[PDB]
């Protein structure tokens with residue numbers, strides 16, 4: 185009834201978190217990796233889609249931030265501004281969020297909601313041994329640059345849904361899995377402790393996220409578009425420039441881009457096969473701090 | 487350029503958090519207390535006020551959640567949806583947020599922003615010995631109910647600002663401090679380990695927050711309005727029913743309501759004086775799970 189400057193989130197019966205869940209016990213000897221995130225609904229492409237998928241992917245993209253640091257995720261908190269009272273929406277969101285948490289053994293230790301334009305905040309916490317974390321700032325000259333899986337599917341699915349690129353129903357059924365349920369590379373990240381010099385997940389595309397590695401590490405890169413892992417659909421259309429743009433800078437892949445000494449090539453390829461991933465070395469970190477991209481004819485651009 | 491279903495928050499240069507700040511070392515032997523929160527701007531009473539104060543109080547109210555659990559706050563994360571690019575706004579918010587953090591020795595280990603209707607999410611993390619936490623669910627029959635300081639000032643200030651109750655300029659200068667800069671009772675909370683049976687901060691008013699203690703503890707209460715600590719302004723006007731409503735259920739006090747055995751009365755009063763607080767026993771937790779409130783003439787209502 186009283187109008188305060190702000191509304192605050194309160195415990196949600198649908199999320200069902202006990203107030204004693206706020207206390208956790210970190211494993212002795214471990215450091216904790218912490219990442220907080222905020223997702224705002226896009227009024228120009230509003231998520232009028234299955235709220236189960238919204239919940240599932242909302243956690244997944246935060247689990248991918250833990251993977252990028254080589255951490256074992258253990259706990260999450262959730263706060264949500266809901267634009268109207270809609271019991272069906274929050275129940276379905278919760279189911280998908282909880283499904284993703286179960287798959288990755290994550291406990292929800294806070295779950296609160298309030299009223300307002302749709303906004304979802306997740307904080308995720310995980311464990312790493314001291315000094316064994318992977319950072320974006322620590323890439324080295326003559327590192328191989330690796331990508332953990334195919335790039336461009338999520339962007340291609342999105343382009344097709346938006347009427348921007350023509351896909352068949354069969355092609356869209358293939359790429360759409362990568363859009364709606366990206367699989368965070370949690371076990372890979374833990375396996376890369378001691379082997380990778382730097383890592384970051386690819387959320388805003390290879391150019392942007394490799395770019396963040398280069399800017400924070402004060403180094404450059406040389407990459408080959410032909411070397412980048414590609415799905416069957418993306419590979420088939422990879423002669424088209426619109427598709428090459430998606431491979432290099434499409435959103436929402438949620439693979440890891442990581443760097444490592446050429447000494448560890450064989451061990452890293454072996455890990456990739458052991459986890460059923462399609463990884464490749466795409467290029468090399470250089471001393472000269474430019475990003476040069478060789479297209480399919482091997483001709484460079486900066 | 488590409489329209490995705492959601493915009494995600496990215497690291498903010500104004501908040502200036504290094505990517506290595508995401509790794510923390512919990513003190514060996516301690517449990518961690520974690521609280522996440524979301525504040526949504528109220529379009530019916532929009533915060534067109536000093537953003538420094540918005541930043542300061544945004545952290546303060548989360549520090550109060552740590553105080554309520556008896557935890558030593560150590561780390562926070564921050565994510566914000568900003569409704570337009572306004573460098574002045576975020577710089578001033580940041581200054582106030584950081585001022586509050588400095589006062590309580592809290593490190594900011596994540597700071598990200600995005601674009602959208604004004605929404606502020608804070609996650610706060612602190613340390614407590616195992617089993618030494620204070621919860622809302624653990625109040626006992628024949629506990630004294632304590633309040634750590636005066637109630638109603640923030641609500642009275644707000645009512646005056648909204649033209650709902652007449653205050654003089656001098657009276658408003660007094661109550662307004664409680665509205666704009668509530669002081670979280672961090673040291674009190676730590677001092678109440680071993681002494682209090684239950685605790686909760688009073689953010690939505692005594693009736694609501696004592697009410698949450700009663701519902702989670704499965705117990706009742708008997709309280710005396712005359713016993714509640716009152717500021718000089720609130721005390722002066724405490725015969726008026728509109729003011730009695732503010733004392734009992736005004737928002738935004740951020741004092742602690744806690745319960746404790748009558749055996750510890752003297753030690754708890756001594757702590758209150760040692761910290762320069764104006765605390766009082768306001769009543770008793772009862773076996774019968776009603777909330778009865780005695781007004782100034784001692785006549786009850788349920």
Ligand code: NA
Pocket residue numbers: 188189190
């Ligand atoms: Na407020």
Ligand code: NA
Pocket residue numbers: 413414
């Ligand atoms: Na291939």
Ligand code: NA
Pocket residue numbers: 490491492
């Ligand atoms: Na999305």
Ligand code: NA
Pocket residue numbers: 715716
């Ligand atoms: Na008094």
